[PDB]
């Protein structure tokens, strides 16, 4: 046993030495990458000054891109005994003990331009630009001399033809979580339109619903939208659960491989794969459940029936299908603290207007001043005179977006910090492996 | 000769259908036993071959 | 820290050594008796009666 | 649109495969040598005992 132990310990020490070697190789590779990153940092700092001509910007961008490509290259072909250390976020195990399980794990990260980030540093992008003036002549919106402030020299201009479409309202209401939409004559559920106030109880996800006895014969169309679909379900008569499958309101086939359930129990109306009565159908089991006060609840909707029609409780229709269904009908969908009315056409009340990116009940109101400037509020003290350029839409900003990097230096520091953290991790692993080698040599000598 | 447990992992069968005497995982009657299903099958002329 | 080629070489050597173990198990005999071929019992007479 | 190339498409990979094969064959020889040495030691012990 001692001979076995000493041989195992010696070979484990050799393995730990191999781990030392691979750690050193990775350390050197990351050192070179760090050198390149510092070079790129100082180049970016030199390029940050605004006193540089365009040609200087192109030259600096070319050299920065070349050095980034060099970083990607050195990440790519860095290898050790058929293993690419920097090509994956993997973990590498080294056997250090003479028994099973005594291993040391090395943390390795995939390093490249993409992982470090910024996907193209693009300093040479067209930077900060001044925006053009209001240009009173271009705005041809609706003319309105109402002037609610009473100033004679102010003229209100509104940009009409911004009537939001039904799909726009649906996207707006779907964007927020916890909204309220009231609709009638919906596909599948709500087709008979016996009830009108559903409100669809939007909680977290695709629209839910709640209905009275309206789907008596509508299970086949709703649960099976296609021509051959089959959906699983669970049926219980109270205190005793059974698993079944439903297809086109026909035979309630059992969930087993080929078991087929027939209807029986006149007066109890129960299931059996081996019944002794006529054929089981969804229409008949509907009144069966209604008389026996059972449930036919499934994963996508909890259904129960009283009489000869099912009472839907916890429906969940697909959001896209619901939106397609409610595109050309009357509904009064509401959003947070706002109510919107649609009657067989988008913005029937003519109170829906599309803002810059959000649906708002009021049109963009622009005021024309005596001096020709265009302001958002009648009081000249405020307003933030509107400007024009490169995007239309009459943006109230003096600055257009620069495609160059928003915060170059901060991202560069983040990348350098990541590389230094990896460096420190490899150094710590190296020291730990060396200590393990020393301890293991002592142990094998003593043994 | 006690509970006629379903061949499922944990499903338990309960008989019902007075006059047809059928098996169900969702029965609406008393607990199922071999003694009474014996006369049920005898009256209805079925087979329980194993 | 080993590539698949090193694993292949080590496995080949291990299989060769195991084959040697099987060979030495089969071959070792003492005067028509294979002492490692069966879970048998061998009686040695050490008494006069 | 393109003529065939006489130069080997991937010299390095095929060469490395050649080294892989030759060292594999060498490993086979090493295993055989160790096996034979063990057999010789065993046989010497057995003949001395016999």
Numbering used by the authors:
A (entry chain a): 53 to 499
B (entry chain b): 301 to 350
C (entry chain c): 103 to 151
D (entry chain e): 450 to 499
The article reads:
The rotating flagellar filament primarily functions as a propeller, acting as an Archimedean screw, and supercoiling of the filament is essential as rotations of a straight filament do not generate thrust. Here, we show the atomic cryo-electron microscopy structures for flagellar filaments from enterohemorrhagic Escherichia coli O157:H7, enteropathogenic E. coli O127:H6, Achromobacter, and Sinorhizobium meliloti, where the outer domains dimerize or tetramerize to form either a sheath or a screw-like surface. A shared feature in all four structures is the formation of symmetrical homodimers between the outer domains of flagellin subunits, with one outer domain rotated 180° relative to the other. These symmetrical dimers are the result of outer domains being able to adopt either an “up” or “down” conformation.
Since a seam breaks the helical symmetry in the EPEC O127:H6 flagellar filament, reconstruction was performed asymmetrically to 4.0 Å. The power spectrum of the EPEC O127:H6 flagellar filament superficially looks similar to the tetrameric Achromobacter filament. However, the Bessel order of many of the layer lines must be different because the EPEC H6 outer domains cannot be reconstructed using the tetrameric flagella symmetry of Achromobacter. We have determined that this is a result of a seam. The EPEC H6 filament ODS is created by an outer domain tetramer with most flagellins being in one of four flagellin outer domain conformations, but the details of this tetramerization are quite different from those in Achromobacter. Due to the presence of the seam, most but not all D2 domains are in one of these four conformations. In one dimer conformation, “D2 Dimer A”, domain D2 of one subunit forms a dimer with D2 from another flagellin that is 11 subunits away. In the other conformation, “D2 Dimer B”, flagellins that are 6-subunits away (Sn:Sn + 6) form dimers with each other. These two dimer conformations are easily observed in the 4.0 Å EPEC H6 map. While a large region of the ODS has very poor density, the resolution of another portion allows the creation of an ab initio atomic model of the complete flagellin structure.
